[PDB]
Amino acid sequence: YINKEKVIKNLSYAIYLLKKMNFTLIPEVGSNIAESLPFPKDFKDVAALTGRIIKNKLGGFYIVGDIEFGASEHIAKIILSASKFNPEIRACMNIKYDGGLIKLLKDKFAVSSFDRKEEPPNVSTMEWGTKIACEKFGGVPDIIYDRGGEGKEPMIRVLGRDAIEVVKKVEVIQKIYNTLEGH
Amino acid sequence: SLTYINKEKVIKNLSYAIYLLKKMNFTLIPEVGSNIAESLPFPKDFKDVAALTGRIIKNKLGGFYIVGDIEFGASEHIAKIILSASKFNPEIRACMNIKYDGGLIKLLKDKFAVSSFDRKEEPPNVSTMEWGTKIACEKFGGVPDIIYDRGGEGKEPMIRVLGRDAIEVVKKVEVIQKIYNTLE
Amino acid sequence: YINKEKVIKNLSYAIYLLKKMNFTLIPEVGSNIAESLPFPKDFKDVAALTGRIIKNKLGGFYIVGDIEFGASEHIAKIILSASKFNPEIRACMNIKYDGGLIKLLKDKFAVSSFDRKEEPPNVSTMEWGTKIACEKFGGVPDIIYDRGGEGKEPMIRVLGRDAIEVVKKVEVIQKIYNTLE
Amino acid sequence: SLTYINKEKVIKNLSYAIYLLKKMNFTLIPEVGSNIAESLPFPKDFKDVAALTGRIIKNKLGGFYIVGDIEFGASEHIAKIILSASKFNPEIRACMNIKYDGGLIKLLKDKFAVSSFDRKEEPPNVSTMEWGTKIACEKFGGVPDIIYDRGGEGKEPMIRVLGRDAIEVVKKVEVIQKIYNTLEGH
Ligand SMILES: [Cl-]
Ligand SMILES: [Cl-]
Ligand SMILES: [Cl-]
Ligand SMILES: [Cl-]
Ligand SMILES: [Cl-]
Ligand SMILES: [Cl-]
Ligand SMILES: [Cl-]
Ligand SMILES: [Cl-]
Ligand SMILES: [Cl-]
Numbered sequence: 104y105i106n107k108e109k110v111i112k113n114l115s116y117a118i119y120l121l122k123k124m125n126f127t128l129i130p131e132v133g134s135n136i137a138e139s140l141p142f143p144k145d146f147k148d149v150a151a152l153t154g155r156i157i158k159n160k161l162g163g164f165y166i167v168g169d170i171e172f173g174a175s176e177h178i179a180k181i182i183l184s185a186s187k188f189n190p191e192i193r194a195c196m197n198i199k200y201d202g203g204l205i206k207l208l209k210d211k212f213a214v215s216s217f218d219r220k221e222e223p224p225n226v227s228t229m230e231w232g233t234k235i236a237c238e239k240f241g242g243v244p245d246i247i248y249d250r251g252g253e254g255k256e257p258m259i260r261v262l263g264r265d266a267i268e269v270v271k272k273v274e275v276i277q278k279i280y281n282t283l284e285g286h
Numbered sequence: 287s288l289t290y291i292n293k294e295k296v297i298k299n300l301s302y303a304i305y306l307l308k309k310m311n312f313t314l315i316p317e318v319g320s321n322i323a324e325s326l327p328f329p330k331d332f333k334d335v336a337a338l339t340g341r342i343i344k345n346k347l348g349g350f351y352i353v354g355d356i357e358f359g360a361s362e363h364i365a366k367i368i369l370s371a372s373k374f375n376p377e378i379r380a381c382m383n384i385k386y387d388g389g390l391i392k393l394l395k396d397k398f399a400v401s402s403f404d405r406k407e408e409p410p411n412v413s414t415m416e417w418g419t420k421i422a423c424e425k426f427g428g429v430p431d432i433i434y435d436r437g438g439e440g441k442e443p444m445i446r447v448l449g450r451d452a453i454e455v456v457k458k459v460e461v462i463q464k465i466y467n468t469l470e
Numbered sequence: 471y472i473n474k475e476k477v478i479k480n481l482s483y484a485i486y487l488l489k490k491m492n493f494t495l496i497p498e499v500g501s502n503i504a505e506s507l508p509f510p511k512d513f514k515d516v517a518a519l520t521g522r523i524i525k526n527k528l529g530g531f532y533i534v535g536d537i538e539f540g541a542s543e544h545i546a547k548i549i550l551s552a553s554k555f556n557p558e559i560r561a562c563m564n565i566k567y568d569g570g571l572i573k574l575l576k577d578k579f580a581v582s583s584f585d586r587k588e589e590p591p592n593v594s595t596m597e598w599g600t601k602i603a604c605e606k607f608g609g610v611p612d613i614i615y616d617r618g619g620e621g622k623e624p625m626i627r628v629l630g631r632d633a634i635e636v637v638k639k640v641e642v643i644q645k646i647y648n649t650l651e
Numbered sequence: 652s653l654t655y656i657n658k659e660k661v662i663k664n665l666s667y668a669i670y671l672l673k674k675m676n677f678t679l680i681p682e683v684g685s686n687i688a689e690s691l692p693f694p695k696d697f698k699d700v701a702a703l704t705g706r707i708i709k710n711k712l713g714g715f716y717i718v719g720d721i722e723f724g725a726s727e728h729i730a731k732i733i734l735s736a737s738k739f740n741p742e743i744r745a746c747m748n749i750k751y752d753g754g755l756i757k758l759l760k761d762k763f764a765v766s767s768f769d770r771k772e773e774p775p776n777v778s779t780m781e782w783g784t785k786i787a788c789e790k791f792g793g794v795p796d797i798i799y800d801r802g803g804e805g806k807e808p809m810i811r812v813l814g815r816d817a818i819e820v821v822k823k824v825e826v827i828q829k830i831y832n833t834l835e836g837h
Binding site: 623 | 682683684710718719803804807
C-alpha cells in the first residue's frame with residue numbers, strides 16, 4: 104500500500120539520510136526532494152519541502168521547511184510527466200549541474216536531457232522537457248538534465264521509485280563529485 | 287580592540303535590519319534567495335563583510351524563511367558588490383539583492399538613483415560582480431541606490447539595493463516593496 | 471521487520487501529526503518523544519529529538535532538533551525499563567502534569583505511578599520509578615506519572631507500542647484536558 | 652551620555668548578546684532552558700521587555716539551540732525580575748537565567764555581588780519572581796550581579812545574572828562559564 108502516510112515517512116527518512124551526507128551538490132536556487140502518491144493527478148498528490156535545501160556558506164547546508172503535500176508545483180510537473188512513461192517512478196530531486204560530472208555519470212547511470220532553447224510555445228518547460236528526455240530514452244532514466252538557458256541555471260534531476268532511492272542515487276553522484284569539486 | 291568595536295556595530299545593524307524585515311510582507315524574493323550584508327569601514331576582502339550564512343527564501347505555505355546566522359565572511363558574492371562600490375564612496379557598506387521586475391524598475395527610476403550593467407559585455411578574466419558594480423558606478427558617477435541587470439545565460443535578473451548600512455537598505459526595500467504592491 | 475529505518479519513519483510521522491495538533495500539554499522542561507528498536511540493550515537503541523518540543527510564547531510551540539539514536543538517555547531509561555515488562559512497548563513521550571487531568575484519565579486509561587520520595591539509594595530515578603509503577607500495575611500501563619519533588623517538575627509519561635500510537639493517545643488526553651479550561 | 656535608549660537600541664543589544672552567546676561553550680543550561688531579556692528604561696510592564704519567544708536549550712548531541720525570535724512582551728517571567736530589580740536601581744534593564752550549582756556559587760561570591768531568596772518563605776498572594784527579587788535586593792541593599800535560589804517543590808534551582816543591558820549580562824555569564832568549565836573538568 105502507498106498512501107499519504109507512506110509518502111511522508113519516505114520523504115522524512117530520505118531527508119534523515121541526507122542529513123548524514125556531505126551534500127554539496129546544491130544549485131543557486133536550492134534543492135528540493137519530492138514524492139507522489141501512485142498515479143498522481145495533480146501537484147496536490149505530490150509532497151515536498153515547503154522551503155528548500157540551501158548551502159550554509161560557513162560549511163554544510165540547511166534543510167528548510169516542512170514536508171507537505173502540494174509544496175512543490177515545480178518538481179511535481181517532472182514527476183507527473185515521468186509517471187506517464189513509468190508509474191513506478193514517484194520521486195525526484197533537483198541537484199547542481201556540472202559538465203564534467205555528467206560525462207562521468209553517463210557511464211554509471213541512465214541519462215537523458217532536453218534543450219530549453221527547443222521549447223515550443225504554450226507548454227510548461229518541466230512538463231515538455233521531461234516528456235522529451237523520456238521519449239528520447241524510451242522510458243524513465245536515472246537522470247534528466249539540461250544545460251540551462253536565459254535566466255535559468257543548468258540542472259541535474261535524479262528520479263527513482265521513491266525519495267529514499269533518489270537520495271541513495273544522489274549519494275553515489277556526490278561521491279564522484281567530491282573528487283571533481285576538490286580539484 | 288578597534289576591530290572588535292567595529293564588528294559589534296555591523297552585527298547590531300544587520301540584526302535590527304532582519305528584525306525589521308521579519309515584520310514586513312516581503313515578497314520581492316528571487317528564486318536564488320535574498321541575502322543582506324554590511325561591511326566594516328574600509329573593507330579589504332569579503333571577510334570584512336558580515337551577512338546571513340543561509341538566505342531569505344520563499345515559504346510555499348506563504349511568507350518566507352530567514353535562514354541562518356549573521357557572520358562575517360558569509361557572503362563573497364555580496365561582499366564583492368560592497369567592496370567595489372566602496373571604491374567610489376567609503377560610506378556605502380551595506381547591500382541586499384531583491385527580485386527583479388521591469389515595471390517596478392521603471393517606477394524606481396523616478397525615485398531612486400539607478401544605474402546598471404549588462405552581463406554580456408563582461409570582459410574576460412574578471413569577477414562579474416566586481417566588474418558589473420564598477421561599471422555601474424563609473425556609469426552613474428558614484429554609488430547609486432540601485433544597481434540592476436537583466437540577467438543572462440544561467441543567471442536570473444536582479445535588483446540590488448545599496449546603502450550606508452543594513453537598516454538604511456531595509457528601509458529602502460520597504461519603500462520599493464510598497465511601490466511594487468501597486469502593480470499586482 | 472522493525473529496524474532503525476522503521477523507527478525513524480515512525481517518529482517522523484508522529485512528529486508530523488503532532489505539529490498539526492493543538493498541543494498545549496507542554497511541561498516547563500519541554501517534551502520529547504522517543505521510540506526504540508525491539509528488545510533495546512541500551513539508550514543507543516533508542517531514537518528521539520536532540521532538542522525538545524517547547525512553548526512558543528507567541529502561541530503554539532517549537533519542535534527543536536533532529537531525530538537521532540542515542541538522543542535521549544532520559545526517556546530511554548523509561549522505555550528500556552518498561553520493555554522488560556512488555557517488549558511490545560517501544561515508545562514514550564513526556565507531557566505536562568495536572569492533578570485534575572490525572573483524575574479524569576484514570577477512568578479511561580491504564581494508569582500507574584511512583585513517588586520520588588520513596589526512591590532507594592544507588593539507583594536511577596527513571597529506571598527505578600518505571601519499574602516500580604509497572605510492578606504496581608502488573609504490567610505496562612498507558613500512563614506513568616509522578617507528582618514531582620524537590621527541584622523536579624511533576625510529569626505525565628504516555629507509553630505505547632510506537633511513536634504514532636503514543637501521539638494518538640496524547641491527542642485524546644489533550645481533548646480531555648481541554649474540558650478543564 | 653547623549654544616548655536615547657529606544658526599542659531599536661534594546662533589540663540591537665539583545666541581538667549582539669546572542670551573537671556572543673552562540674560563540675560560547677555555554678553549558679550552564681537549566682532543564683527549563685534559558686532566556687535573556689532587556690527592557691526599555693523605566694519599564695511599565697512586561698510589554699516594555701524584549702526576549703526570545705522560545706528559549707535556549709541543550710542539543711543532546713552536543714552544544715545548544717537558540718530558539719525563537721527577539722520580541723517585546725515575549726517573557727513575562729524574566730520581565731517580573733527586571734521590573735522588580737529596577738525599583739532598586741533603574742539602571743538595571745537586563746537579566747538571563749542560567750543553571751544553578753552550589754560549588755559554582757561559592758567560587759563566585761568572591762568575584763560577584765550575590766544575593767538570594769527561599770521559595771519556602773514565599774508569602775500568600777504574591778508572584779514568586781517579584782517577591783523573591785524584592786527580598787534578594789532588600790537583603791543586599793540594592794541590585795546584585797546574581798540572584799539565585801535553591802529551588803523547591805517542583806522547581807529546579809536557578810542562578811539569575813543581572814546587568815545594565817543584555818551585553819553586560821552575557822559578559823558576566825562568560826566569566827561564570829569559564830569557572831564552571833574548570834569545575835566540570837575536574
Ligand atoms: Cl521546489
Ligand atoms: Cl529543476
Ligand atoms: Cl546579486
Ligand atoms: Cl529528553
Ligand atoms: Cl520525564
Ligand atoms: Cl534517571
Ligand atoms: Cl522566559
Ligand atoms: Cl528564573
Ligand atoms: Cl513568578
